[PDB]
Amino acid sequence: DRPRFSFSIAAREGKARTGTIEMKRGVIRTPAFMPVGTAATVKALATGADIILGNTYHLMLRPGAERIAKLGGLHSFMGWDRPILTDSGGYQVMSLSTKQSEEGVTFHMLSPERSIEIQHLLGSDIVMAFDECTPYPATPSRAASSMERSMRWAKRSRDAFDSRKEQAENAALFGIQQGSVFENLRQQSADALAEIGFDGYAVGGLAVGEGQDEMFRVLDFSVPMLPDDKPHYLMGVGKPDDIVGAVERGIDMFDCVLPTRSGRNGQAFTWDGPINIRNARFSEDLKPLDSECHCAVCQKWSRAYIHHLIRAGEILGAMLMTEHNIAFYQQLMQKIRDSISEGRFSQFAQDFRARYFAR
Amino acid sequence: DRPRFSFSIAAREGKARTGTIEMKRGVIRTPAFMPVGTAATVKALATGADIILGNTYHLMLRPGAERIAKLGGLHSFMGWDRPILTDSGGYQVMSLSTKQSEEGVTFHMLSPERSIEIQHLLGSDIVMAFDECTPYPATPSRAASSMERSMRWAKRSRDAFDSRKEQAENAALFGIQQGSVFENLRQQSADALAEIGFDGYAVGGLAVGEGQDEMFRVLDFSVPMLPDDKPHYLMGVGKPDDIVGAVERGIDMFDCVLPTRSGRNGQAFTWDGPINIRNARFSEDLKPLDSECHCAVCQKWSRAYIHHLIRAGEILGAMLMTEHNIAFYQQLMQKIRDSISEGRFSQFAQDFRARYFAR
Ligand SMILES: Cc1ccc(CCc2c3nc[nH]c3cc3c(=O)[nH]c(N)nc23)cc1
Ligand SMILES: Cc1ccc(CCc2c3nc[nH]c3cc3c(=O)[nH]c(N)nc23)cc1
Ligand SMILES: [Zn+2]
Ligand SMILES: [Zn+2]
């Protein structure tokens, strides 16, 4: 059948690439948007996807990784038979929960070994190494010390993953680059990860308050340090314009939680920029959320009706907004893939920004 | 094409009837459950219906009946091309908002004439007369005075409806019986409504705290006072067992808001009674919400997953619960219609109660 893990690049334009990841549970077209699976009914890729996210930090607390395993794993639990990616829980413990040491983080304990076992019990297909997302801003010394611990933890994550036969033979493991905003530390981190060897490489430690200009600056030198022949996952990013610029700099995978969060608060993404549907200017607007969007919501209902539902406190309004936002991001990713494949991505990015920041 | 309004009875068992209402926008199979249209995406009848409810009291306040008319009416607004029923707003003004007089109710003014015009602007197909839902309990004198005012208002509602050509020719008007729990006042009210003449007759003034035994007692003598050859709508009812007992007493139409409210609070309806999915006993339950339910939710997801979603605060959990509850009520109505048509409704009601109140 399909291999455990293959990445093939079908077309390139500058630093941008488009291709496919093959795994046992399915194919992932890249650049890929990976939505959380619990925010709406995600279908096989529209309000769908090739791969969804599990929420390791939440699941290890409710109902617990052992219970998820008892219930058949996340694929059975969520009714999703395609690939699933889980984070290692390190970022979320530090953001939401903490006592740190070389062994791991107490808050329950979380270590590289326990993080890998938790992701094993959940049954995810893409497993993230257990890292430390360095806070921003950070001094060079603090960023270096943090990156060095993350690299020791990456080696421990590799070894823990390899010691579980079912996981080593059926899942894939991604290493996470750290180093804050410092080119020399980003290089040393990429070097360390490449020596250990991973199936994919994530750019960690961004989307931590640095702003888009700084994030793009860091991606300019950081992504080329990663192995070219493996997928590149930018964690925590982001807005549609973040995605286009990150693809321009060689990123292949994205996890944006914004579209599934924005929907509950009334924010809809459109080709003309985001709008807040609760605003009174939409109370009589008979256009769909976006006039070109092909999602089920825009095929049927107006801005005026979704405005009404959300203002009325109807959960239906938020669900429709969420379904539209997920669909818009997937339509964005499809246009990105098509334009790279056709050698017109540079023009697309230009056209996208001009319209997105016009209105 | 179809007539403005026809009701045909296809089969009877005791006082129970099953049949069809024909209107210009579609056919309604009876006994019918009429869900609110804003609680989930309701499809053509499953998580669907032959007719949905509009919320007159909410709509006249946000965005206003004139604005709904400017947007094309509720059918265009909600994307629903089949029949729509609206209440007259009298109950809701008194429950949720008040100064009453023979002219109407100030809170905005609401009169029989204004209520009919509001329902005209909304474009509903079944229009309710403007009544006063008598509070419970009520003395005979207070119940009589209230019923008598409602009957004068029913005549004013009839005249207002008939004076709007588009409405008189394309919609239907239902009169509402009052009289609290008093047989002689229920009779006088039915007499008054029959002399005015309506397309259907509602039993009003119940589901106001009287309890199921008292409600059934009042239906025992009240429903036979209404014209047999016209549909009978019990307003505000109710639980599944309320519906079965009310069909046994000659009711044809129901509006239950409970299934669309219960879903948000974790209550699911099953053939074994209601359950609260948030209860810890469902955290590892791999069965669907109901093992016989044919809805999309029970085809795909477990109690354990819906429990997880709701406990996690995910709006998806409440939406799935709502979709299941709407579907369960429609499956209930289908079994009621089939069993009356097959002459086995008495046995069905017996079997239903024995299982529903067992667990
Ligand atoms: C469900 C879910 C969605 C997204 C994430 C990714 C969370 C996330 C970041 N989010 C913003 N910036 C981020 C940086 C890192 C990082 O450096 N390391 C890890 N392990 N995760 C990150 C985790 C869980
Ligand atoms: C959206 C919506 C749903 C349901 C209703 C029906 C509201 C309702 C009653 N609810 C409980 N008991 C009820 C009695 C009456 C009544 O006597 N008169 C009217 N006009 N409505 C009633 C109105 C609006
Ligand atoms: Zn859309
Ligand atoms: Zn169901």
Side-chain angles (χ1 to χ4, degrees), chain A residues 2-42 44-61 63-66 68-91 94-95 101-102 104-107 109-141 143-164 167-194 196-238 240-260 262-263 265-280 282-290 292-298 301-314 316-359, chain B residues 2-42 44-61 63-66 68-91 94-95 101-102 104-107 109-141 143-164 167-194 196-238 240-260 262-263 265-280 282-290 292-298 301-314 316-359:
Chain A
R2 266 183 307 276
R4 180 188 68 82
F5 195 88
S6 185
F7 177 55
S8 51
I9 294 162
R12 309 186 76 118
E13 182 173 345
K15 296 185 179 177
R17 316 98 70 74
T18 182
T20 53
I21 296 174
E22 285 184 70
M23 308 195 66
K24 285 177 188 199
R25 283 193 183 265
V27 177
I28 309 166
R29 295 163 281 192
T30 68
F33 166 53
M34 313 184 289
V36 309
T38 61
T41 297
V42 185
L45 201 56
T47 308
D50 289 331
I51 174 172
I52 62 167
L53 305 183
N55 191 339
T56 303
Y57 177 72
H58 182 93
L59 291 158
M60 67 183 284
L61 301 178
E66 285 274 348
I68 290 296
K70 185 183 186 296
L71 299 179
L74 268 186
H75 291 90
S76 182
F77 191 59
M78 302 177 71
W80 177 265
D81 55 16
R82 282 182 184 263
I84 291 173
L85 184 147
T86 52
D87 202 4
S88 53
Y91 172 92
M94 293 313 293
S95 66
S101 78
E102 189 63 30
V105 182
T106 310
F107 70 102
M109 226 269 171
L110 208 40
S111 57
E113 294 79 14
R114 178 53 182 167
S115 171
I116 294 321
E117 172 56 13
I118 284 171
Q119 299 180 71
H120 176 45
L121 291 168
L122 295 177
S124 57
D125 304 272
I126 300 190
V127 174
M128 300 306 297
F130 182 75
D131 63 326
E132 172 179 295
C133 178
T134 309
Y136 179 84
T139 65
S141 165
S145 292
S146 173
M147 179 276 289
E148 289 153 9
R149 170 168 285 169
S150 288
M151 298 304 93
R152 300 188 291 269
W153 285 358
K155 172 58 181 168
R156 283 169 62 196
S157 302
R158 173 90 266 174
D159 292 342
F161 180 97
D162 292 338
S163 77
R164 295 160 160 80
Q167 197 171 35
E169 289 182 8
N170 298 292
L173 183 68
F174 276 37
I176 308 181
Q177 182 201 44
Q178 297 287 345
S180 180
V181 300
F182 302 107
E183 186 175 11
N184 67 325
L185 303 180
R186 285 283 168 179
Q187 183 64 73
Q188 300 171 16
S189 182
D191 286 349
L193 296 175
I196 300 167
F198 291 93
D199 296 309
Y201 295 83
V203 176
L206 297 172
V208 288
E210 72 281 3
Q212 188 191 80
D213 291 346
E214 184 76 346
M215 187 189 73
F216 284 171
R217 180 182 87 78
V218 171
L219 294 177
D220 284 338
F221 58 72
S222 295
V223 186
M225 303 167 175
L226 308 174
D228 176 78
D229 64 353
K230 302 231 187 310
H232 306 154
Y233 167 24
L234 176 55
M235 308 186 83
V237 166
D241 47 306
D242 292 332
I243 290 172
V244 176
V247 171
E248 293 179 284
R249 293 157 171 87
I251 297 299
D252 306 304
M253 291 161 62
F254 299 94
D255 63 47
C256 325
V257 163
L258 192 65
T260 59
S262 297
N265 303 319
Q267 179 170 246
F269 292 93
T270 84
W271 293 113
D272 300 292
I275 60 171
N276 193 310
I277 206 61
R278 304 184 56 120
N279 190 287
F282 299 111
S283 60
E284 305 189 351
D285 188 340
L286 292 180
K287 300 186 300 294
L289 290 170
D290 181 276
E292 305 174 1
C293 176
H294 302 125
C295 89
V297 176
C298 296
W301 296 290
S302 62
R303 291 160 171 200
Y305 184 52
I306 302 167
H307 165 95
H308 177 84
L309 293 169
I310 302 205
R311 292 289 297 266
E314 291 296 346
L316 177 58
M319 185 65 46
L320 294 177
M321 294 273 294
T322 300
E323 291 168 2
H324 161 78
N325 281 348
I326 293 173
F328 178 83
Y329 270 62
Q330 295 295 4
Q331 282 167 100
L332 172 64
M333 305 313 297
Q334 183 65 44
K335 287 171 190 291
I336 287 167
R337 291 191 296 266
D338 284 330
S339 65
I340 298 168
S341 186
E342 302 176 3
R344 59 186 178 79
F345 174 61
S346 170
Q347 190 64 53
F348 168 76
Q350 252 181 84
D351 293 338
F352 165 83
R353 289 190 270 268
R355 187 175 161 188
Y356 196 79
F357 300 117
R359 310 202 306 97
Chain B
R2 266 183 307 276
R4 180 188 68 82
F5 195 88
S6 185
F7 177 55
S8 51
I9 294 162
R12 309 186 76 118
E13 182 173 345
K15 296 185 179 177
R17 316 98 70 74
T18 182
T20 53
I21 296 174
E22 285 184 70
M23 308 195 66
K24 285 177 188 199
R25 283 193 183 265
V27 177
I28 309 166
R29 295 163 281 192
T30 68
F33 166 53
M34 313 184 289
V36 309
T38 61
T41 297
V42 185
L45 201 56
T47 308
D50 289 331
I51 174 172
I52 62 167
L53 305 183
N55 191 339
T56 303
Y57 177 72
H58 182 93
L59 291 158
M60 67 183 284
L61 301 178
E66 285 274 348
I68 290 296
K70 185 183 186 296
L71 299 179
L74 268 186
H75 291 90
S76 182
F77 191 59
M78 302 177 71
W80 177 265
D81 55 16
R82 282 182 184 263
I84 291 173
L85 184 147
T86 52
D87 202 4
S88 53
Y91 172 92
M94 293 313 293
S95 66
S101 78
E102 189 63 30
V105 182
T106 310
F107 70 102
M109 226 269 171
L110 208 40
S111 57
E113 294 79 14
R114 178 53 182 167
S115 171
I116 294 321
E117 172 56 13
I118 284 171
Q119 299 180 71
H120 176 45
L121 291 168
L122 295 177
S124 57
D125 304 272
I126 300 190
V127 174
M128 300 306 297
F130 182 75
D131 63 326
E132 172 179 295
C133 178
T134 309
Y136 179 84
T139 65
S141 165
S145 292
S146 173
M147 179 276 289
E148 289 153 9
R149 170 168 285 169
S150 288
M151 298 304 93
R152 300 188 291 269
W153 285 358
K155 172 58 181 168
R156 283 169 62 196
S157 302
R158 173 90 266 174
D159 292 342
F161 180 97
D162 292 338
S163 77
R164 295 160 160 80
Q167 197 171 35
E169 289 182 8
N170 298 292
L173 183 68
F174 276 37
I176 308 181
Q177 182 201 44
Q178 297 287 345
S180 180
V181 300
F182 302 107
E183 186 175 11
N184 67 325
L185 303 180
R186 285 283 168 179
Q187 183 64 73
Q188 300 171 16
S189 182
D191 286 349
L193 296 175
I196 300 167
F198 291 93
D199 296 309
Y201 295 83
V203 176
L206 297 172
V208 288
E210 72 281 3
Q212 188 191 80
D213 291 346
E214 184 76 346
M215 187 189 73
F216 284 171
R217 180 182 87 78
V218 171
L219 294 177
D220 284 338
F221 58 72
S222 295
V223 186
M225 303 167 175
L226 308 174
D228 176 78
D229 64 353
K230 302 231 187 310
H232 306 154
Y233 167 24
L234 176 55
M235 308 186 83
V237 166
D241 47 306
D242 292 332
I243 290 172
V244 176
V247 171
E248 293 179 284
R249 293 157 171 87
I251 297 299
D252 306 304
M253 291 161 62
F254 299 94
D255 63 47
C256 325
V257 163
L258 192 65
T260 59
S262 297
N265 303 319
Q267 179 170 246
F269 292 93
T270 84
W271 293 113
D272 300 292
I275 60 171
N276 193 310
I277 206 61
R278 304 184 56 120
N279 190 287
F282 299 111
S283 60
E284 305 189 351
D285 188 340
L286 292 180
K287 300 186 300 294
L289 290 170
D290 181 276
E292 305 174 1
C293 176
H294 302 125
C295 89
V297 176
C298 296
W301 296 290
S302 62
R303 291 160 171 200
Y305 184 52
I306 302 167
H307 165 95
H308 177 84
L309 293 169
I310 302 205
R311 292 289 297 266
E314 291 296 346
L316 177 58
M319 185 65 46
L320 294 177
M321 294 273 294
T322 300
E323 291 168 2
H324 161 78
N325 281 348
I326 293 173
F328 178 83
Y329 270 62
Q330 295 295 4
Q331 282 167 100
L332 172 64
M333 305 313 297
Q334 183 65 44
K335 287 171 190 291
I336 287 167
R337 291 191 296 266
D338 284 330
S339 65
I340 298 168
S341 186
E342 302 176 3
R344 59 186 178 79
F345 174 61
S346 170
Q347 190 64 53
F348 168 76
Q350 252 181 84
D351 293 338
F352 165 83
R353 289 190 270 268
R355 187 175 161 188
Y356 196 79
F357 300 117
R359 310 202 306 97

